[PDB]
Design an enzyme around this catalytic site. Structure first.
Site: not given
Length: 298
Positions: A132, A220
């Protein structure tokens, strides 16, 4: 053995057809973060036999406290899951679970080189090189890190999927689509959504990216807020599920864990070795199991 995954335009293919796979992300692997007890062969075979999961993600912490850089035991836990996934003919994501991976490039390269050498010949293995990224440039920060790490994997493993994080906590797939990695085959791009926080705005960015001809992979996603806590958003989750089924987008729910937060799939104290009765799932875990078990088989 499982089908080798490839990318053609905005699709991931298996057995010559668009294909997508559903399962769970493990929590952070980090020493004393609580997720680590679930990094084992019994959880992996339970996810397959009881949840019908075809995907598991090993979320290996990097520069965060108790992560791989300071405690190499993180990798032993990744190894256990990857070995177990291969034994159970399940896809496994090896996730370099960093928000700043481009600051640890040499360490990323060395790790992915080791994983490529050991596991490159198994079709199960999926490399995720940058969980991320934060509010950083695709073209100037992420892409060049991606190019360097992909080059190193591809010298050893010419085929297996490599999923690349996108700006703004892997939201800006439309931005990545405007400057794709063209130099290497079988590259897909990370999309992350949390249904308590993200709806049609992020779906529109995803649609733009697909329209621009890149493949997405939801390594995710949560049914609760982006911060991993809050109420389960059933209606928005179902909207995301339909989007992902329509576009054949693979998905791993955050997280297979027992911490007291909305994103945990399991009540506190749920067995480290699986076997959970449905009453030891949270609302998030029950919703995630219903989604994974119902996922098109192809």
């Amino acid at each position: 053995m499982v089908a080798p995954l490839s990318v053609q335009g905005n699709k991931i293919l298996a057995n010559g057809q668009p294909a997508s796979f559903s399962g769970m992300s493990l929590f952070w692997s980090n020493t004393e973060w609580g997720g680590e007890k679930y990094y084992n062969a019994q959880v992996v075979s339970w996810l397959k036999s009881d949840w019908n999961a075809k995907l598991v993600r090993a979320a290996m912490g990097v520069e965060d406290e108790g992560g791989y850089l300071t405690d190499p035991a993180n990798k032993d836990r990744v190894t256990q899951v990857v070995d177990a996934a291969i034994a159970n003919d399940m896809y496994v994501i090896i996730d370099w679970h960093s928000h700043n991976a481009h600051q640890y490039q040499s360490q990323a390269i060395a790790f992915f080189q080791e994983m490529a050498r050991k596991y490159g010949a198994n079709n199960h293995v999926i490399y995720e090189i940058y969980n991320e990224p934060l509010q950083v440039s695709w073209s100037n920060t992420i892409k060049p890190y991606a190019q360097a790490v992909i080059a190193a994997i591809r010298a050893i493993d010419p085929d297996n999927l490599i999923i690349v994080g996108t700006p703004t906590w892997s939201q800006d797939v439309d931005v990545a689509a405007n400057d794709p990695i063209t130099g290497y085959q079988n590259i897909a791009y990370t999309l992350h959504f949390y249904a308590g926080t993200h709806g049609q705005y992020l779906r529109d960015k995803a649609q733009t990216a697909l329209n621009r001809g890149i493949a997405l992979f939801v390594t995710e996603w949560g049914s609760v807020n982006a911060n991993g806590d809050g109420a389960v958003a059933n209606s928005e989750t179902n909207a995301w599920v339909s989007f992902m089924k329509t576009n054949h987008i693979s998905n791993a729910n955050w997280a297979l864990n027992d911490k007291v937060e909305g994103a945990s799939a399991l009540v506190p104290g749920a067995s480290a070795n699986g076997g959970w009765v449905n009453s030891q799932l949270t609302a998030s875990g029950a919703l995630a199991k219903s989604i994974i078990s119902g996922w098109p088989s192809y």
